[PDB]
Amino acid sequence: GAYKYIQELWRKKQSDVMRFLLRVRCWQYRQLSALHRAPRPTRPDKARRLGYKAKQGYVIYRIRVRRG
Amino acid sequence: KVVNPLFEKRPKNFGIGQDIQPKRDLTRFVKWPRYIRLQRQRAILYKRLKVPPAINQFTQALDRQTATQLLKLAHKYRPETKQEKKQRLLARAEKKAAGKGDVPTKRPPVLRAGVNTVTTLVENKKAQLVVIAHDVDPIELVVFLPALCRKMGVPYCIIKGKARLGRLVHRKTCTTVAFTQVNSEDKGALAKLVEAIRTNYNDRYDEIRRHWGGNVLGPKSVARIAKLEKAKAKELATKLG
Amino acid sequence: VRPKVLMRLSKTKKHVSRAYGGSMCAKCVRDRIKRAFLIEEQKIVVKVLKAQAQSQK
Amino acid sequence: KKKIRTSPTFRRPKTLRLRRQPKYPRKSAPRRNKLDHYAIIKFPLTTESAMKKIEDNNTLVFIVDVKANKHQIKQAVKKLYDIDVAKVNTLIRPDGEKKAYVRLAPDYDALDVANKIGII
Amino acid sequence: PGRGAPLAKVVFRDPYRFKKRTELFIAAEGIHTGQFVYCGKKAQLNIGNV
RNA sequence: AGGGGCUCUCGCUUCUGGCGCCAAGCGCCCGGCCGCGCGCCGGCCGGGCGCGACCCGCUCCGGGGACAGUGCCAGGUGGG
Ligand SMILES: [Mg+2]
Ligand SMILES: [Mg+2]
Ligand SMILES: [Mg+2]
Ligand SMILES: [Zn+2]
């Protein structure tokens, strides 16, 4: 049931918990460099429903795009 | 008594413009690498900002002596490793070969790890106790778990150490661990620890749920405002009376 | 001479038998000697002037 | 106490760098030295200027490979002609091969060396 | 060059390692070679000091 | 007239075109040598620690600062 709880929590993006987490993680991704390798998926339920499996040979890269 | 007259105390003074500075400790003023600056400023940020109660509850961890007592209890019921497991399988195979037969022989109680597993256990009221690590670094895999264990009425505790959980379950890290039913000689150890944990966590959940966190200023800022408050009080106490 | 011929010369041809010899002139050597001496003497007399004017409250 | 940072600069701490112990050589055998002595010396030169150099300066003159240097030419001559070499002056011709004059040690004689070679 | 306002090459003593450090102060009028200049909050109000 | 509470004081460089780093000293230990040979015990060769160089602390220090700035839209201006 755990992934269902994470899924509902990540749909509640304007809650105070999620807006705190999003702001602090946005701050630290801003402090990192533009193309970066993550050591693990930040959103594991989203990653697995998009195809990721916790095996050797699946890697995760964080990319920053200048928006507009 | 026979000391040499050629030896002499020759001190050096380290005033400004005088003899050059000694290699004193510089560890506060180091140009640190950016990952060190990032983790230090992340810790500072958490303390500075207003942290919601669903994360403050994970800040409120357990007392050390009860934590060690719980670990002793968990070490009594830790899962088995691969080598002792295969020894158990070969022993089962040889006793099945000769000669008493199927013999399930009362499959022992064991700890149950993993957030999906314990979410099912809490949801169907199977667990006697839930223990959750305080430093899950993506802290949103567990922020629903205290409310869930509260509503189901299962006692849960926030332990201080994810690696400590992982080491008792023979891996690197582990998020949560559930206690199911236990043998008779440790039922009394439970029958003290469970109401200790329940009085620490479940009975004061509303206070926990409304108690906010963070929002403390830096040492320089609190020193400056304390200077201003005492610099007003030191003459207001003389104006009064 | 040129610097690389200075490499293959000898130590006597490149310096003078004096302290700071072959880098400074004799006149400024003498002036720095007596300047060091006189400034240390002035520091001694200021220290003993304070040490005798420890005779107050 | 008692570990102290006496410098305001963090430097990358030096670590262990292992040598290679490969599981297999990337190629099978060492490559053949295709510049051996017979490849170094191609043929002698037998022009009139060559004969003048032979009878006057106790020196032979060969057309040699473009890749060969004076050390390789001297070693190749001393090996496959079994003589001693005083010095070697080389040029590259406007056709593109290396002409090498090799002056022998004085106890040897360019006349009888050229007689043993057969350019005489 | 391209400036004319003279520069003062001034040598200070480094306080943390055995070395002398040179600066390139803008020369205030009246200063001369071989004089001392002083820099800090407790320097005296003379011409050329900082 | 001993002082503490109360401030400036826990500040050591200004007549001179010099020098200045890679610690002196003190205190406590550890080892070998002969050896008083009775033990903090005699001395000879070494080695270490601490104070000298105060202790804690969560942003390197200072200046700004929820503005600036940037993204998107809107109005004006725009023979560049
Ligand atoms: Mg000379
Ligand atoms: Mg040439
Ligand atoms: Mg037009
Ligand atoms: Zn001079």
User: With contacts defined as CB-CB under 8 Å, which chain B residues touch D5?
Assistant: 25-27, 30
Sign of CA dihedral C39, C40, C42, C46: positive
Q: Which residues of chain B lie closer than 8 angstroms to D4, CB-CB?
A: 23, 25-27
CA of E20 to the centre of ligand 1 (A): 30
Query: Residue D2: which of B104, E20, E37, B25 has the closest Cα?
Result: B25
Q: Are D119 and D81 in contact (CB under 8 A)?
A: no
What are the φ/ψ torsions at residue D50 (nearest 5 degrees)? -60, -45
| DSSP classification of residue D18 | P
Ligand 4: distance of its center to the CA of E1 in Å?
29
* CA-closest candidate to residue B104, choices B119, B116, B121, B92: B92
Where is D77: in which H helix or E strand? helix D70-80
- Residue D109: partners with Cβ closer than 8 Å, 6 or more residues away: D58
Is residue D23 within 8 A of residue D69, CB to CB? The reply is: no
Q: Is the peptide bond before B218 cis (omega within 30 degrees of 0)?
A: no
**Does residue E35 sit in helix, strand or coil?**
coil
Please indicate if any CB of chain B lies within 8 Å of the CB of E36: no
Judge residue C51's burial from the number of C-beta atoms within 10 Å of its C-beta, 0-12 exposed, 13-18 middle, 19 or more buried.
Answer: exposed
Spatial separation of the C-alpha atoms in residues B24 and D4, rounded to whole Å: 8
Amino acid at E27: A
Residue E32 identity (one-letter amino acid): H
Helices (H), C3-25: 3-8, 11-14
Which pairing describes strands B112-113 and D41-44: parallel, antiparallel, or unpaired?
unpaired
D3 interfaces chain B, CB cutoff of 8 Å: no
**By the 8 A CB rule, do A17 and B143 touch?**
yes
Region of residue D79 (phi > 0: left; psi between -120 and 50: alpha; otherwise: beta): alpha
Contact A28, A50 (CB under 8 A): no
Span CA (C57) to C1' (F3), Å: 17
Q: Test B27 with D9 for CB contact under 8 angstroms.
A: no
For residue D117, what is the enclosing H or E element?
Answer: helix D110-117
**Residue D57, CA distances (Å) to C26, D108, D114 in order:** 61, 12, 13
E14–chain B nearest CA distance, Å: 8
Q: How far apart are CA B115 and CA A44, in angstroms?
A: 13
Please choose, from the candidates D29, D38, D52, D67, the residue with its C-alpha nearest in 3D space to the C-alpha of residue D101. Answer: D52
Q: What are the helix (H) ranges across chain B?
A: 34-48, 53-59, 64-76, 82-97, 115-123, 145-152, 162-168, 187-200, 205-210, 219-239
* Resolution value (Å, 1 decimal): 2.8
How many degrees, rounded to 5, is the angle at CA E13 between CA E8 and CA E15?
140
Structure tokens at A2: 């755990």
Cα dihedral angle (A29, A30, A35, A39), rounded to 10 degrees?
-20
Integer Cα distance of B20 and B13 in angstroms = 9
- Assess contact for D71 and D82: CB atoms under 8 A: no
CA B33 to chain D, closest CA, distance in angstroms equals: 7
CA angle at residue E23 from E17 to E25, to 5 degrees?
A: 150
* B218 contacts B170 by C-beta, under 8 angstroms: no
CA C12 centroid distance within chain:
22
Please state the separation of Cα C14 from the chain's center in Å.
Answer: 21
Residue type, B27: T
Residues of B in contact with E17 (CB under 8 A): 20
Within 13 Å, how many C-alpha atoms sit on residue C21's CB side? 9
- CA atoms within a 13 Å half-sphere pointing along the CA-CB vector of B13: 4
- Cα D105 from chain centroid (whole Å): 19
The whole-angstrom separation of Cα D105 and Cα D86 is 5
Of B49, B54, B138, the CB nearest to A42: B138
Q: What is the DSSP letter of D12?
A: P
- Do residues B74 and B111 lie in contact, with contact meaning Cβ atoms separated by under 8 Å? yes
Q: Residue A68 and residue A66: Cα distance in Å, rounded?
A: 7
Distance, in Å, from the CA atom of B2 to the CA atom of B129, rounded to the nearest integer, reads: 76
Token representation of residue D73 = 């030419």
The token duo for B35 is 């990952």
- Strand-pair partners of D88: D102
Q: Which of A9, E15, E7, C54 is nearest to B119 (CA)?
A: A9
The DSSP bridge partners found for residue E20 are E13
Question: What single DSSP character describes residue C24?
Answer: B
Is residue B209 within 8 Å of residue B149, measured between CB atoms?
no
What's the longest Cα–Cα distance across chain B?
A: 98
- The answer to whether the Cα torsion of B150, B156, B158, B162 is positive or negative is negative
Record the tokens describing residue D108, joined without a space. 């040897």
CA D98 to chain centre: 13
Q: Are B151 and B119 in contact (CB under 8 A)?
A: no
Measure the CA–CA gap between D50 and A28, rounded to whole angstroms.
Answer: 80
Contact E10, E23 (CB under 8 A): yes
For the CA of B234 and the C1' of F5, the distance in angstroms is: 14
Helices (H) and strands (E) in chain B — how many of each?
A: 10, 6
Give the residue among B137, B168, B169, B142 at the shortest CA–CA distance from B156. B142
Kindly compute the dihedral angle of the four CA atoms of residues B132, B134, B138, B139, in this order, to the nearest 10 degrees: 80
Give residue B138's identity as a one-letter amino acid code: P
Q: CA D89 to CA D46: how far, in whole Å? A: 17
Please name every residue paired with D111 in a beta bridge, in sequence order, or none if there are none.
none
Are D11 and B30 within 8 A, CB to CB? Answer: no
- CA separation (Å) from A68 to A19, A65, B112? 22, 9, 48
Asked if B66 and B196 touch (Cβ cutoff 8 Å), the reply is yes
Q: How far is CA B187 from CA B64, B68, B183, B199, D96, in A?
A: 21, 17, 7, 18, 98
CB B30 within 8 A of CB D5: yes
Contacts for B140 with CB less than 8 Å, ≥ 6 apart: A6, A9, A10, A17, A18, A21
Torsion of CA A18, A21, A27, A28, to 10 degrees: -140
* Closest C-alpha to B68, from B191, B130, B160, B185: B160
